[PDB]
Design a protein around this ligand. Structure first.
Ligand SMILES: C[C@@H](C(=O)N1CCOCC1)N1CC[C@H](NS(=O)(=O)/C=C/c2ccc(Cl)s2)C1=O
Ligand SMILES: [Ca+2]
Ligand code: NA
Lengths: 28, 250, 10
């Protein structure tokens, strides 16, 4: 239910060093 | 992981280490999907051609880890296994078709900054995210070359088109597999490797910001070889079996 | 290589 949300990232709205690369690849 | 980098603290809180009691050694990756259940590749537990047939008791799972070898006091939780379930139609005889297994833990593990479950996709998330070009993320403590890492490694790789996957190998590819990796000279490389098996291939939904486990690290003809790709168990295609086992024995 | 884990786990 609270799956896939990381306490040290998503829960405190921080981003890891390379997650932007993944999002950038989701073009459509 | 070949050509990856050091994972950040808490970057992958569903990463589970599959650890043998004796001799003490890392067996495989696995991933945490609830407080009682851990997912992994079936071949990590059962592979007769190599006399691999592990029983609950031969094993432990270490959750919340970062360092490969250290006992990370107050950080990691180590659990005993209540029961192992292997996909009834896992094809170890041929091509590791349906390379998947569930592990029920004796007790629930407590969540923390370092231990948190990953989501499993539904039909919509699969369709929407499993497309050639889209990148996913693989993590593990397996070989760095075809020694071993001090810390959890991470690599992001793009999903590859089905025909290119088929054309890279003599092995019969099924609908329960997908491959990922860069093509030769794209200017980037990277791959999973021995020891990474059973670990998760994850993608972050841009619709709800949640991480979803799309694949399980399954096999490859070498590690980070040019013109070769890693193969992953297609998690959503095997979801009816996952839900089945969980609804029956949980 | 591997650091001894508490014996309660074994
Ligand atoms: C073909 C396959 C196989 O038949 N297996 C897997 C191991 O367990 C027995 C059956 N296999 C045998 C050896 C090989 N391991 S390896 O060359 O270290 C590259 C591991 C991986 C690279 C990319 C992914 Cl994904 S994973 C591998 O994956
Ligand atoms: Ca072929
Ligand atoms: Na490659």
């Amino acid at each position: 239910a609270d799956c896939g949300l990381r306490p040290l990232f998503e829960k405190k709205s921080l981003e890891d060093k390379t997650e932007r690369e993944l999002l950038e690849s989701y073009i459509d | 992981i070949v050509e990856g980098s050091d994972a950040e603290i808490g970057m992958s809180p569903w990463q589970v280490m599959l650890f043998r009691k004796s001799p003490q050694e890392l067996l495989c990756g696995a991933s945490l999907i609830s407080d009682r259940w851990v997912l992994t590749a079936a071949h990590c537990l059962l592979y007769p051609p190599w006399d691999k047939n592990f029983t609950e008791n031969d094993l432990l799972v270490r959750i919340g880890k970062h360092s490969r070898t250290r006992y990370e006091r107050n950080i990691e939780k180590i659990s005993m296994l209540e029961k192992i379930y292997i996909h009834p139609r896992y094809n170890w005889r041929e091509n590791l078709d349906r390379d998947i297994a569930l592990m029920k833990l004796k007790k629930p593990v407590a969540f923390s900054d370092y231990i948190h479950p990953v989501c499993l996709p539904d039909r919509e998330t699969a369709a929407s995210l499993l497309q050639a070009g889209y990148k996913g993320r693989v993590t593990g403590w397996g070989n760095l070359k075809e020694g071993q890492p001090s810390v959890l490694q991470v690599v992001n790789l793009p999903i590859v088109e089905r025909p290119v996957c088929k054309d890279s190998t003599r092995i019969r590819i099924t609908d329960n597999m997908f491959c990922a990796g860069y093509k030769p000279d794209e200017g980037k490389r990277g791959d999973a490797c021995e020891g990474d098996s059973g670990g998760p291939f994850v993608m972050k939904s841009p619709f709800n910001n949640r991480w979803y486990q799309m694949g399980i690290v399954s096999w490859g003809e070498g590690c980070d070889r040019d013109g070769k790709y890693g193969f992953y168990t297609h998690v959503f295609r095997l979801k009816k079996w996952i839900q089945k086992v969980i609804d029956q024995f949980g | 290589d591997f650091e001894e884990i508490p014996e309660e786990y074994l």
